[PDB]
Scaffold this active site. Structure first.
Site: not given
Ligand SMILES: O=C[C@H](O)[C@H](O)[C@H](O)[C@H](O)CO
Ligand SMILES: O=C[C@H](O)[C@H](O)[C@H](O)[C@H](O)CO
Ligand SMILES: O=C[C@H](O)[C@H](O)[C@H](O)[C@H](O)CO
Ligand SMILES: O=C[C@H](O)[C@H](O)[C@H](O)[C@H](O)CO
Lengths: 389, 389, 389, 389
Positions: D86, D345, D375, D377
């Site tokens: 991300c 996203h 954030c 993953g």
């Protein structure tokens, strides 16, 4: 001797349309019950089920049997599938007719069923694949639509025939538009209601009753047909418009001796007097019917002038016109309610489907003599003669 | 009335073995040639070729028609496949009998083929797969091995029969080794040489001739059969040691009226006196042979005592015993040269394979009255009574 | 300013060989552990791990982070992968060196990793596939070895160079044998022991410790080389024998400031004095090292003559030869222990792989100034200059 | 010293929506052209293109290079992709900044691009599939949305955060609805026009121009959210509605030294004052922006209170509420124009995506100091501080 006590078929569905997710045995199941109830015979009375199917891949053990079991036919009976390609659905009818003539059975349910939508892609992978791409093969195209001898699509066998008889693009398009017009005529008049049994497509977003042929095109003009590009040969004549479609559906019929019919107070749709199948060159499979139809008439002792009505499979306008030209039957008793170009062609069911059209259209107009014939991929033909009781 | 002019089968390959990459119709083509050569009868004279086949995915249009064309049957003739599972091979023969019996045909080549090795993996992929993993299916297991009603393997139906007929681990293991012993013997004795027709595996490494079955395991002992684990029920009793396997193979027989053989100066291998098929609970499909054979015998007007030999397909040592014990027939004339447990199980072909071992043995030992019979996934059986001259 | 405190690599595995089923992040994990251990540095001191990887499909989220976490690098640290094809393993070290230089990190593990064996086949199936065949694409070939602009394999860009520089089949095969022989000699002499860390391939029937580069051919002959056929152009010159291979492997380096090194008492393997990357024509990607080495050298302020040792990646004999002629450095100081033709070419790892060989050979012989360089598919070069402290 | 001269992003398409069949490098190409055009910088002057991408399988060699070449960046340039999930698209900007800081480059185009639509399914098939079914793996889910350490979906790490911070379904659905209403208002008002460069989807049956974010729901209701079922724990809170979506898009910034921009008379979008990356527990990856932002602000010398605008990635309502809660900044300066619940996203691009929205909103409102943060993953965070010139 052997009568067709009763008939039935789903409506023909468009490729990836109404039955995009419906398994064939499930259309065969509904179609099986229809002929059971239409004749007032109980499933506990059906010796065996014979079902034409060309694309069985992924459906699990012997689909013909799942269709009989789901239909309500008791397990002590027997069921099986078979494949003479496009002629499969009608060959099954003749095969069922033979079980009874040899006294190996009282009552057979015969026809075919196809789901071209549900046909998977496949690949042989046991050997592993050390390196490089491999092809995922579309079983509908490979096992159903592609000549195993000349390596090309059935649309090319239709370009060959076209050249043979010198059929112009115009003539083919005329035939194509007539087909669509005759079917649009029959649909809106109700001449398909009888032979059609509705099918309920169980669903999550709410049930759905399908009872109309969705492939038929409305307002099909010569003009709309002439703006089309060739679909196989870039300088050719065969198009998406003047050729059958890829479809889903099923079609069966109940068979028993004529005496059996009388015992139960049943008024059959017709008696099967003769059938016949002959092979021709795969390159010109479209010519199949001519030798097949004449062979049948011979076994019947009939003349091509004795026919009141004809259902002649419309694989392609090309081959359709050339079959009419040679046999010379009145083109106003052929495919009265249109044909495959409009109605569609769920391969394995198609031969039993036009049998349905032929039989019910004989009952409403009072014709006494009818014939059903289809060309077959790989170079074959098959035909049958029905006589009104 | 109807005789078997002759017969021939290929040797049975091991799964992924000697015919690892040989398409079904290839093995069929050899076998079709084989019956024609052995009878001295031109290909042109063949009306129709009928072959059972359960695993046709990816093999192209009407593989039965492909076997006939490579064998040299003219385009004029006709070909078609069918699917009654494990009985397919024996069912084509009777159907071939009916073509002639109803006078629609004079000369038939019928039998079965199967390339379990070439069987592909597949999945339906037309509606797309928006998101998430999916399964690529093994057609062999999906369409050949798994019950379409209860979702489990044939071995689990063989287990059911075990629990039912209280068959134990030993009884089964004894049956398997006795089968592996009889086969190895017959092979050594040269007892298979006449029925088998050598197939050349046209390779790049070098042309290999396959003239013997390769699944036959020499030196089978109960001791080694006992060191095996259960692969269907952890605490069960059905083992890979006491069950048939996955196999490739093809088999056939030339059919014609008895007078025809006569005028043609052909000494026939037998006459088909009758046949039948009945259904049973799919969960105990191995019992097929029981009703089906009691059916066929009756139609033959024979008593079980009248048989001088028998071929009862060896699916599993469970279903097999339960058959032997219910009919009562003398076990020492049942499967004289071994069974599928030792020989192999090329699904569609097993019905035409056993017919061969029966006919050449009925002739080697001069038996008068025979009978072949199998059980069929989905809960059925096929039976047929043979009679030499 | 910035030094390489320690380095390490796994042995290189043959395609589907020693690491046939070993994911790349596992190889990375062993290598992260080795550089830490060899340097006297604790995992909890690592700020970031940076790993070149070209073929991550199917491995899961951020394999770099998986290697780091399996290595015991703490969750507080960060990790990421990057892809500049064949240059990936070297570029990652330059990038690591940059985190430190700009004051953003103190301690970096940098390198690359690759399991070409574990690369999957794949297909886009979200929109479905209406009808017709589709390829299951080999991610290794597609994403690793095929040019994206002209559509041909890297070995074809090698032909392009062979024609451009007029390089004979013979000259390339000689180069091919020389590389193999140098590598085998270096292997037997134990010249790879320092740089290689053993990898344990976990098993159930026995763990296996791999510590020898298995792609190196022993006793390779010119005749074995001359007998091969061109593999990319029918009348071509590049063969499997004079090209690199498909391999599995990982390799890494631990970076920190020179002053941080001194504080810890570590005697570094070298100081990084400069690097460069430059693009070329995709059609002749093999030439990437020329402008890159020249830019690196200029940035360092060195002449080609100042180099004591060179590691120039052997993608193909053809391009390797052209770079040597173009740059003009004594070939006797280039790939002194063999190159990719013998050792193998794990795409993402190779750049760090040859950094390892450069570094330990430099210390071994006391060479002051070194250079590592690779050509890159898509038409790029990368080079790095190293000097001993 | 390093400024952002110009920026651009495509509209964000919906899963299998407007860019269903558009390769990611094609979106990237358009964005590279746009930043060049908006800055007044020629393609010839670009040294390097750096693009985040998480799902490159099947797209071919180094998609970053394909985009730069397609956009017209000369072959002498270089290009590479990277992956910190991300965070990829924002990291790429920091990395490009570092090339310039260390004096290795002058002009960089950096961002990210992703086509979640076009991500393929895959399977490792080299070793060979022994027999039976195998899994075809969805690369998007496996490599994009699934944690490699704990095995569950990112939506589960969000449930972890929810429980930990005791966030009700109500607070989350309120956050979800607010995000949609803000973005819809911003869309209606034309606040996305500046940042968006139209995209032309080529089409045989017509070209379509895409210049609006299509994931955004118009008139979203609280009831629409409340109705949904939790998607990851059956008695949980996180739903499809309060989670971000699956999308396609690309985004970029063009970088150069402040002194360079001045020479060219370019008025930059902002000065890059600092950035930071930090790992956290994978179990609670959603918390990543907390330590990353604090470290970024600490590096810039700023108080949380000094920020005028903030873009904080909306992975899940749960994690976004937690970030805001712990960081404590005025929520009315955060995602002033909506966030990823509304806008979408596209993994590799989102970090540049939020960079774009922050840069153009900062310019319109005259804000002096801003922050972007995501954030990641696997348990990480990235943030970057921007000041107006
Ligand atoms: O400069 C430190 C080194 O990298 C190691 O100590 C060395 O590589 C050895 O091989 C360790 O096993
Ligand atoms: O349509 C053009 C763009 O929206 C602008 O030129 C933009 O503001 C640039 O990024 C300026 O640096
Ligand atoms: O298991 C780790 C802790 O419970 C904290 O969550 C940790 O310090 C994270 O990295 C920040 O969220
Ligand atoms: O500048 C006006 C914005 O639209 C708001 O700041 C927005 O609503 C906040 O993010 C929520 O409180």
């Amino acid at each position: 001797s052997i009568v067709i006590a009763s008939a039935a078929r789903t409506a023909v569905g468009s490729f990836n349309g109404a039955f995009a997710n419906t398994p064939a045995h499930e259309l065969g199941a509904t179609v099986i019950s229809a002929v059971l109830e239409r004749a007032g015979v109980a499933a506990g009375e059906v010796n065996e089920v014979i079902l034409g199917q060309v694309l069985p891949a992924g459906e699990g053990q012997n689909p013909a049997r799942q269709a009989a079991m789901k239909a309500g036919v008791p397990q002590e009976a027997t069921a099986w599938g078979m494949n003479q390609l496009c002629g499969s659905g009608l060959r099954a009818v003749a095969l069922g007719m033979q079980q009874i003539a040899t006294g190996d059975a009282s009552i057979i349910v015969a026809g075919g069923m196809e789901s071209m939508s549900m046909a998977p892609h496949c690949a042989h992978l046991r050997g592993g694949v050390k390196m490089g791409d491999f092809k995922m093969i579309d079983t509908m195209i490979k096992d159903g639509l592609t000549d195993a001898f000349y390596g090309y699509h059935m649309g090319t066998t239709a370009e060959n025939v076209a050249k043979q008889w010198q059929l112009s693009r115009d003539e083919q398009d005329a035939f194509a538009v007539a087909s669509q017009n005759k079917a649009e005529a029959a649909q809106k008049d109700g001449r398909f209601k009888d032979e059609i049994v509705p099918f309920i497509v169980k669903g999550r977003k709410g049930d759905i009753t399908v009872d109309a042929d969705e492939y038929i095109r409305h307002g099909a003009t010569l003009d709309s047909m002439a703006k089309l590009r060739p679909a196989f040969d870039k300088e050719g004549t065969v198009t998406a418009g003047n050729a059958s479609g890829l479809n889903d559906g099923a079609a069966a019929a109940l068979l028993m001796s004529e005496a059996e019919a009388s015992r139960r107070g049943i008024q059959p749709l017709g008696r099967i007097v003769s059938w016949a199948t002959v092979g021709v060159d795969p390159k010109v499979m479209g010519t199949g019917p001519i030798p097949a139809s004449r062979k049948a008439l011979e076994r019947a002792g009939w003349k091509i002038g004795d026919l009141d009505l004809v259902e002649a499979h419309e694989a392609f306008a090309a081959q359709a016109c050339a079959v009419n030209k040679d046999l010379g039957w009145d083109p106003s008793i052929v495919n009265v309610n249109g044909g495959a170009i409009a109605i569609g062609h769920p391969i394995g069911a198609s031969g039993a489907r036009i049998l349905n059209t032929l039989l019910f259209e004989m009952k409403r107009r009072g014709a006494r003599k009818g014939l059903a014939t289809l060309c077959i991929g790989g170079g074959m033909g098959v035909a049958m003669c029905i006589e009104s009781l």
